[PDB]
XYZ file of C-alpha atoms in Angstrom:
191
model
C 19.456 26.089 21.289
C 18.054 29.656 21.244
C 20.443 31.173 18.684
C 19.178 28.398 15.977
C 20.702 25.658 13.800
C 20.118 24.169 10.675
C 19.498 20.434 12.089
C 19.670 17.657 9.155
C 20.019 17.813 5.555
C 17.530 15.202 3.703
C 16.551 13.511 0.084
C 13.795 11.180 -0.694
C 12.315 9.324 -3.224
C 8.963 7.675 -3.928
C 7.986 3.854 -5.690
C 4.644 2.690 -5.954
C 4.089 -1.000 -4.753
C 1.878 -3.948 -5.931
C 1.504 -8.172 -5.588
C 1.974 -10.101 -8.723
C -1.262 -11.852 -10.334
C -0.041 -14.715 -13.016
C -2.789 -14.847 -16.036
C -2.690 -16.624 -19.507
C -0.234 -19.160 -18.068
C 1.275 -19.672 -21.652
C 4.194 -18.325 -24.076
C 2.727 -14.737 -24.506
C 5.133 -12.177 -26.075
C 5.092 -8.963 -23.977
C 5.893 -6.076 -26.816
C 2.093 -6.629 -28.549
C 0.252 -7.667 -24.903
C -1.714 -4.566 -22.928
C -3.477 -4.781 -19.606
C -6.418 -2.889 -17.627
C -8.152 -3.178 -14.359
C -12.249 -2.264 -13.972
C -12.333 -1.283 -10.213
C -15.461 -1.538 -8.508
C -15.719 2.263 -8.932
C -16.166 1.754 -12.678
C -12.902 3.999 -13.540
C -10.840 1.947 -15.912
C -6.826 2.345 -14.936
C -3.772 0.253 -16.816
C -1.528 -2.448 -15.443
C 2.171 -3.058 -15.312
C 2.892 -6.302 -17.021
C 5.565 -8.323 -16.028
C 7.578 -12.062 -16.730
C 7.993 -13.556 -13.467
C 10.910 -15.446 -12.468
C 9.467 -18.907 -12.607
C 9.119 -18.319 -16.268
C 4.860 -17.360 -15.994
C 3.636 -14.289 -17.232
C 1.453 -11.131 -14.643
C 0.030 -8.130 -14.308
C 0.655 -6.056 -11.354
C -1.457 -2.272 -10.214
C -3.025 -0.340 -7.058
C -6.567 -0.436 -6.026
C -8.563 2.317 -5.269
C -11.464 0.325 -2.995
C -12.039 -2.979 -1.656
C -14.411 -6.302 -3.268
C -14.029 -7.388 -6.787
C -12.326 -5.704 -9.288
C -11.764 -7.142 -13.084
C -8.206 -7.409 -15.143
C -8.943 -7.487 -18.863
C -5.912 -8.462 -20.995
C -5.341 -7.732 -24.401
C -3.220 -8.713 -27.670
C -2.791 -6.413 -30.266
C -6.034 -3.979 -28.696
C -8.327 -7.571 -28.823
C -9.069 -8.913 -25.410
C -7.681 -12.858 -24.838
C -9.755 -15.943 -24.174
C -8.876 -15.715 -20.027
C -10.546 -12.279 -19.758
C -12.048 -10.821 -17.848
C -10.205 -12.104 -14.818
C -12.098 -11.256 -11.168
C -9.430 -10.414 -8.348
C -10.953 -9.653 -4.855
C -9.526 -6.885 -2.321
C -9.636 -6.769 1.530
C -9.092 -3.762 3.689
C -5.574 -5.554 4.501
C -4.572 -5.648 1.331
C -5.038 -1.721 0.717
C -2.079 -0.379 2.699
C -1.115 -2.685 6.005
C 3.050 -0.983 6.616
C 3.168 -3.902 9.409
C 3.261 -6.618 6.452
C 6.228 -4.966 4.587
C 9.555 -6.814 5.075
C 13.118 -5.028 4.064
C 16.906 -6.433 3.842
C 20.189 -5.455 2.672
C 23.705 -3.724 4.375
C 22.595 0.117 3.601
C 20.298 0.021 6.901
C 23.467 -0.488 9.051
C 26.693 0.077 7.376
C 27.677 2.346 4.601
C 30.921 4.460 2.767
C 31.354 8.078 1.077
C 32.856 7.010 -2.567
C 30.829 3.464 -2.613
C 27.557 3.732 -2.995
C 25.330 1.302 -0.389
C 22.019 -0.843 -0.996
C 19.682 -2.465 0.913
C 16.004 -4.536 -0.825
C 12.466 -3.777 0.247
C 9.756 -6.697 -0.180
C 6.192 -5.363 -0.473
C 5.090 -8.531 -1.995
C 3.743 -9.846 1.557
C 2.161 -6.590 2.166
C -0.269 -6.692 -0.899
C -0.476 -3.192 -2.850
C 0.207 0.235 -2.325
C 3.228 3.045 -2.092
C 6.716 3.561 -0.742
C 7.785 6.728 0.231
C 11.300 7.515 1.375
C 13.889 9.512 2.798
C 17.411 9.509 3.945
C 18.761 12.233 5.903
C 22.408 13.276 7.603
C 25.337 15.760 7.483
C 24.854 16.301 3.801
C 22.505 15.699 0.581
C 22.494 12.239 -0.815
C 21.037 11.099 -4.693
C 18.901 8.080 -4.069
C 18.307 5.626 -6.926
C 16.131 2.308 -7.484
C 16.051 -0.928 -9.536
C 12.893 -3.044 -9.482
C 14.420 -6.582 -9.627
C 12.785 -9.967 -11.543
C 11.956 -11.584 -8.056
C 9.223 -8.936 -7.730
C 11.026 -6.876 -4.544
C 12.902 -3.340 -4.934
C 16.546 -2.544 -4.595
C 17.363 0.906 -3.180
C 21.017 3.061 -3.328
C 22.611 5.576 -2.189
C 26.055 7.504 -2.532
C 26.713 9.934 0.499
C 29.040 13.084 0.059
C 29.976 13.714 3.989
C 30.999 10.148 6.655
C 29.308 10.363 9.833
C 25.431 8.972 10.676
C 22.431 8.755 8.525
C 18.849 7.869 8.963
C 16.901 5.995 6.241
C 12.778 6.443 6.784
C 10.620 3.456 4.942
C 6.901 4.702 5.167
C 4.074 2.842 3.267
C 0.826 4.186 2.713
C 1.484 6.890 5.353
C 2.531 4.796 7.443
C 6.703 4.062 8.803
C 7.165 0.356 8.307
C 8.754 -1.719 10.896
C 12.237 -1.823 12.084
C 12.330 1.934 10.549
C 14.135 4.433 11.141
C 17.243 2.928 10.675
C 20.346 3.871 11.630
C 23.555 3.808 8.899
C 27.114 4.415 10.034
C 29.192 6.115 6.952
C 32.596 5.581 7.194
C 35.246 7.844 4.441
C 38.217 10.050 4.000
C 38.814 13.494 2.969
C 39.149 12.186 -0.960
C 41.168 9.696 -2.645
C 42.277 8.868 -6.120
């Protein structure tokens, strides 16, 4: 309309996203343990470590190029017997948003005073970053929870009832399935 609106308000929020590699299959402590990868590149960068749910110990990270990078892990600053441990990147594994899966009741149905979720797997897609953004008739605070079965829980509380859109994007790129569609259902406050 010529005399201008506003639109959409809008929040977003940003995770970064990597597959699980199991090393030193053993009962590691994780408080003294440290770990590293050696890209191809030759720019040493750390590693999230992680206990897995079947009971194994990982590391997880991003890479910057494809072919073999190197994990060195380390107790107490000294490197253990398994390192260095060889990983090797394709192209597909770099950023593909077609691989990443999502699930949960906060991509169709929501309320005002309840806050809804909804789970994003990125485990299947390999490594990289989500980026994301709900908008409607009013500002929302986003939160997140990464979760022991190596996927991503996502929340929201919404101030206003009426329609939002959720946006999933990975690596520049809007995932599929997205955007999505929430009905918000609420009253005008309640004790």
């Amino acid at each position: 309309g010529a005399m201008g609106d506003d639109s959409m308000r809008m929040s977003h929020l940003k995770v970064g996203s990597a597959a699980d590699i199991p090393i030193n299959i053993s009962e590691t402590d994780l408080s003294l343990l440290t770990a590293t990868v050696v890209p191809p590149s030759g720019r040493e960068e750390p590693c999230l470590l992680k206990r897995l749910r079947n009971g194994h110990v990982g590391i997880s990270f991003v890479p910057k190029e494809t072919g073999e990078h190197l994990v060195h892990v380390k107790k107490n600053g000294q490197h253990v017997a398994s390192s260095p441990i060889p990983v090797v990147i394709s192209q597909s594994e770099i950023g593909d948003a077609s691989r990443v899966r999502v699930s949960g009741q906060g991509l169709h149905e929501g309320h005002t005073f309840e806050p809804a979720e909804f789970i994003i797997d990125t485990r299947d897609a390999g490594y990289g970053g989500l980026s994301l953004s709900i908008e409607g008739p009013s500002k929302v605070d986003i939160n997140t929870e990464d979760l022991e079965d190596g996927t991503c829980r996502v929340t929201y509380c919404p101030t206003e009832p009426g329609n939002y859109i959720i946006n999933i994007k990975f690596a520049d790129q809007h995932v599929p399935g997205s955007p999505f569609s929430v009905k918000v259902t609420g009253e005008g406050r309640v004790k």
